[PDB]
Amino acid sequence: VGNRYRLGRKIGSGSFGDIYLGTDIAAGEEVAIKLECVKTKHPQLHIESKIYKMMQGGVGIPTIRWCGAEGDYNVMVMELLGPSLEDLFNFCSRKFSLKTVLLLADQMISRIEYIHSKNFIHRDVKPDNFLMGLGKKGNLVYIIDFGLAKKYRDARTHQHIPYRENKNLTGTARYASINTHLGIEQSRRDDLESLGYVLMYFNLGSLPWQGLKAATKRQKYERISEKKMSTPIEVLCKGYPSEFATYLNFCRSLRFDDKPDYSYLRQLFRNLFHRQGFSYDYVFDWNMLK
Amino acid sequence: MVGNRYRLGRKIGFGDIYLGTDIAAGEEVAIKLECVKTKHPQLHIESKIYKMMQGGVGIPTIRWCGAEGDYNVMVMELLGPSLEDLFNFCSRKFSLKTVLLLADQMISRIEYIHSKNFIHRDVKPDNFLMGLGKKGNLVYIIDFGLAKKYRDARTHQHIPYRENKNLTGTARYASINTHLGIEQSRRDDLESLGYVLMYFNLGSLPWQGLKAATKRQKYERISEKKMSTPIEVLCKGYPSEFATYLNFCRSLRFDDKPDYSYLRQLFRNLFHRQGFSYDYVFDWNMLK
Ligand SMILES: CC(C)(C)NC(=O)N1CCn2nc(-c3ccc(F)c(Cl)c3)c(C(N)=O)c2C1
Ligand SMILES: CC(C)(C)NC(=O)N1CCn2nc(-c3ccc(F)c(Cl)c3)c(C(N)=O)c2C1
């Protein structure tokens, strides 16, 4: 955009707009650029940039270099990050070692806790929304995409949003909490339950509610909801360390406005990591690729 | 380039060049692919020249990967745009300050290659790249595909004078002796740089856009125009240092060692007299 940014390859899309790799010619830096049509009915890129700015300084929160307008677009320039966890799962033949799953789990719980500490819920916890850093930040898991994020409490009083029903499923149905499928207003517990499904997806290679055929989105979400509700946690997690089922049961037991015990959840996986005798070196499956 | 470690991205350019990602190291890189069954293999030969030059200021770091399927693969660290790309981004006009900042590094890059016993033989704006990030003020040199050893590493015995040589390289920037079929030596790399500097000053050289019946005839028309344009006419209206630089290069004997410091001093003194500051703010750093 303008005379400064050269747009490269389109690297897909997030919530509302296309994302490209690019070059900031003036600063001499490779970056990533998100474009929103300036005349869009529901503008949110500037709202999203202010969420990233409010979250700035938090571990694994990407830096926004610039957010403004150029031609027919609202533009947000982000620092260049590495592949998403879904990309890395594909590069690793859709199989992660237990050690890589546990290393990711620790950081993913912390990123969600941080967002919650800043009064927001993410509402779209999925592998594609966690990116590894590049270079010296290659061991750091970042969280992206605040397009569906919502404030769950007043920053001043900490008064929680009220319980609501008949809500539409926004987010990715594969990883949605059961309460989300049932139309309940999302809260802190839902971000963590979704992470529990992401962890089991990394363990299994797929979830048992994937690949269900449907003619419409509405039908597909119903089939996923029914399968997800009718699969006991102890069946879903069969043949994997008990910590994955304990984690999911804990999240599903939380009241709508409960504060999650994030340290208890990290400790489940940290204790398992120690019992397995794994080294604390941050060597992930993809670091072994030749 | 693949295997399981490198993901190929967009093609950016002896073979094709792609942006890519080293998944294992977590680094964005560039990857060059040469067909394994090519008639004239040169990628492995080029990789050894880069490795021998390693550690020199502005020499890119590489990794020879060998044969991966149907390709020979070479991975290079990720660099920024070439000077031709930046010239285009700057509307094919560079300020005198940007030309002088570039000249100092370009003379030193050629001197380094010469100190490592090679001549480059394809000095052109596309073969100089700026670095990215903390290396954004550094000019790198690339492409050793036409490079040749001009002297023995130990004895410094120079290669002999030869005639009837073919013009390899870019005709626009070739030295007059290159057009005349004379064996290239150190002087030729520096004369080519002199034309690159005047190309940045002018926006074009007076031997550009010449029409001809064949490429052979076009190269002859470029040669005729370069020989028929006195240095003082080519450089008219620009600081005398550009003409002094070109006259010096054209005065060198075939095996003479160039006085690189004399040439850098011409432009360093001019930069000081012009009252420019070493803030390293190039024309492209002002783009909005
Ligand atoms: C450098 C390679 C090609 C490995 N990186 C990626 O594949 N990416 C994953 C997908 N992805 N998505 C983003 C991204 C996410 C959200 C954004 F708003 C913006 Cl501007 C960029 C970014 C980023 N900041 O570099 C990336 C980076
Ligand atoms: C990051 C952006 C896209 C701005 N870079 C470029 O436009 N490039 C200029 C063109 N260019 N050419 C190369 C290059 C030259 C020679 C090589 F053998 C290899 Cl593998 C790469 C490279 C490199 N090492 O990054 C580049 C880099």
Side-chain angles (χ1 to χ4, degrees), chain A residues 1-5 7-9 11-12 14 17-52 54-55 57-135 137-155 157-216 218-237 239-290, chain B residues 3-6 8-13 15-35 38 41-67 69-92 94-287:
Chain A
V1 297
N3 308 69
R4 183 174 176 166
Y5 307 99
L7 231 51
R9 181 168 65 87
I11 56 167
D18 296 323
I19 298 161
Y20 298 83
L21 288 178
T23 315
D24 179 342
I25 303 303
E29 299 275 7
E30 195 66 2
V31 293
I33 305 164
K34 190 171 188 182
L35 304 178
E36 175 187 70
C37 300
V38 70
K39 297 193 190 168
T40 198
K41 203 175 169 186
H42 304 280
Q44 78 89 40
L45 192 61
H46 285 83
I47 289 161
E48 200 190 0
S49 74
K50 47 143 125 230
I51 299 167
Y52 279 110
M54 183 272 290
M55 304 274 180
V59 173
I61 301 292
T63 296
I64 302 313
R65 291 177 62 87
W66 187 68
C67 184
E70 262 303 311
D72 295 317
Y73 299 98
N74 286 122
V75 179
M76 189 182 72
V77 180
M78 184 176 287
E79 67 177 307
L80 186 66
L81 298 174
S84 75
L85 297 183
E86 178 66 17
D87 293 332
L88 293 161
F89 195 53
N90 282 323
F91 296 146
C92 294
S93 304
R94 302 187 62 79
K95 297 168 274 289
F96 283 162
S97 65
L98 175 64
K99 181 183 168 178
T100 279
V101 177
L102 299 181
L103 284 169
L104 292 172
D106 195 67
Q107 293 198 51
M108 295 161 90
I109 299 157
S110 295
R111 298 302 156 264
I112 292 168
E113 180 176 5
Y114 177 78
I115 294 163
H116 294 173
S117 80
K118 295 292 178 176
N119 313 310
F120 277 78
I121 48 177
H122 186 279
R123 305 206 299 176
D124 200 13
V125 171
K126 60 176 179 175
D128 322 64
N129 280 341
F130 292 93
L131 310 185
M132 294 307 299
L134 291 169
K137 312 257 189 158
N139 288 335
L140 179 57
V141 178
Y142 287 78
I143 190 155
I144 59 158
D145 200 326
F146 291 99
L148 294 172
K150 177 174 177 165
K151 219 173 264 181
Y152 72 93
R153 68 176 185 194
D154 184 87
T157 68
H158 285 187
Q159 175 175 348
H160 202 278
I161 57 168
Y163 193 88
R164 294 289 179 257
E165 299 168 64
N166 312 304
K167 299 292 302 304
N168 294 305
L169 192 156
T170 60
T172 309
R174 192 188 295 170
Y175 310 105
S177 68
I178 285 170
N179 279 135
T180 293
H181 281 289
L182 300 176
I184 309 306
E185 185 78 69
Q186 289 171 239
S187 71
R188 292 175 283 197
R189 61 189 181 170
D190 301 287
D191 281 349
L192 296 172
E193 180 179 332
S194 292
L195 176 55
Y197 298 137
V198 173
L199 300 176
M200 280 306 306
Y201 164 81
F202 289 154
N203 284 328
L204 290 163
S206 65
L207 288 164
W209 45 83
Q210 273 182 240
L212 301 178
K213 192 185 172 65
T216 65
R218 199 203 311 102
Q219 283 165 201
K220 197 159 163 93
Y221 288 13
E222 294 162 349
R223 296 200 66 204
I224 292 169
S225 178
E226 280 181 38
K227 183 63 177 180
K228 188 180 285 168
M229 279 185 288
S230 68
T231 303
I233 292 166
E234 290 154 310
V235 170
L236 172 66
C237 303
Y240 288 90
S242 74
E243 289 79 4
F244 295 101
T246 300
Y247 176 95
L248 280 166
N249 258 310
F250 179 87
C251 295
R252 293 244 282 269
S253 80
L254 293 168
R255 298 183 188 88
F256 172 71
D257 63 351
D258 275 351
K259 179 184 181 181
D261 194 335
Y262 309 93
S263 291
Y264 167 71
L265 300 168
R266 277 187 295 266
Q267 204 62 40
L268 293 166
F269 299 128
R270 285 180 185 196
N271 287 347
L272 175 57
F273 193 90
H274 178 78
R275 290 202 319 279
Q276 291 283 155
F278 298 147
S279 303
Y280 304 83
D281 55 15
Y282 303 97
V283 176
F284 300 98
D285 295 335
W286 55 89
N287 300 138
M288 311 298 266
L289 294 171
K290 293 297 282 168
Chain B
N4 302 332
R5 190 178 174 169
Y6 307 97
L8 232 50
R10 179 170 66 86
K11 191 168 79 179
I12 61 169
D16 297 322
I17 297 163
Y18 297 83
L19 292 181
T21 315
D22 179 341
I23 301 305
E27 252 131 19
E28 195 67 0
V29 294
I31 304 166
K32 190 171 187 181
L33 304 179
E34 175 186 70
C35 298
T38 194
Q42 68 174 71
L43 196 57
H44 183 39
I45 295 154
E46 260 197 85
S47 76
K48 297 174 163 172
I49 299 166
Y50 278 110
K51 288 298 277 178
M52 183 274 290
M53 305 273 180
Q54 195 181 255
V57 170
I59 302 291
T61 304
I62 65 91
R63 187 186 195 252
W64 169 248
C65 297
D70 295 317
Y71 300 98
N72 289 307
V73 177
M74 192 185 68
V75 180
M76 184 175 289
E77 69 179 304
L78 186 66
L79 301 174
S82 76
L83 295 183
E84 178 67 14
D85 294 333
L86 294 160
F87 195 53
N88 282 325
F89 296 144
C90 294
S91 304
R92 302 186 61 79
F94 284 161
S95 65
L96 176 60
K97 179 188 170 174
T98 279
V99 176
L100 298 182
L101 286 169
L102 295 171
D104 195 66
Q105 294 196 54
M106 294 161 92
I107 296 158
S108 293
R109 213 65 64 247
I110 289 169
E111 180 178 2
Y112 176 79
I113 294 164
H114 295 173
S115 81
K116 294 291 178 176
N117 314 310
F118 277 77
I119 48 176
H120 186 278
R121 305 205 300 176
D122 200 14
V123 172
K124 60 177 180 175
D126 269 313
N127 281 342
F128 293 92
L129 310 187
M130 293 307 298
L132 293 168
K134 287 175 81 178
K135 313 256 187 162
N137 289 333
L138 179 56
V139 178
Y140 286 78
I141 191 154
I142 58 159
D143 200 323
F144 290 100
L146 292 170
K148 176 175 177 164
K149 220 174 80 270
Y150 72 93
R151 65 172 188 190
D152 190 81
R154 176 59 178 93
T155 71
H156 288 180
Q157 177 170 3
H158 202 277
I159 57 168
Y161 193 90
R162 292 291 179 258
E163 298 169 56
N164 310 305
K165 300 293 305 305
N166 294 304
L167 191 157
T168 61
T170 311
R172 191 188 296 170
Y173 308 105
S175 69
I176 286 170
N177 277 318
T178 293
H179 284 286
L180 300 176
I182 308 305
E183 183 80 69
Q184 288 172 239
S185 70
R186 293 174 284 199
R187 62 188 181 170
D188 303 286
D189 280 349
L190 295 171
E191 180 177 331
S192 292
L193 175 58
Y195 298 139
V196 174
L197 299 176
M198 280 305 307
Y199 165 81
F200 289 154
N201 284 330
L202 290 162
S204 66
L205 288 163
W207 47 83
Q208 275 181 241
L210 298 180
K211 310 299 184 189
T214 60
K215 187 167 92 163
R216 277 169 281 185
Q217 194 213 331
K218 185 188 186 193
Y219 285 12
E220 291 166 10
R221 295 200 65 213
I222 292 164
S223 177
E224 172 188 47
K225 186 63 176 183
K226 276 179 185 159
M227 294 186 282
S228 309
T229 301
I231 291 165
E232 288 157 302
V233 171
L234 171 67
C235 302
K236 202 153 45 154
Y238 288 89
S240 71
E241 289 79 3
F242 294 101
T244 301
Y245 176 98
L246 278 167
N247 259 311
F248 179 84
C249 295
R250 293 245 250 114
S251 80
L252 290 168
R253 300 183 187 90
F254 172 71
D255 62 353
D256 274 351
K257 178 183 181 174
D259 193 333
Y260 308 94
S261 291
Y262 166 73
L263 300 169
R264 276 186 295 264
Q265 200 62 215
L266 294 167
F267 301 127
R268 284 181 185 201
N269 180 59
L270 175 64
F271 188 98
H272 174 253
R273 292 201 320 280
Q274 292 284 322
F276 301 142
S277 64
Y278 283 105
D279 58 8
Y280 283 83
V281 175
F282 298 98
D283 295 335
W284 55 89
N285 298 138
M286 311 293 267
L287 295 170

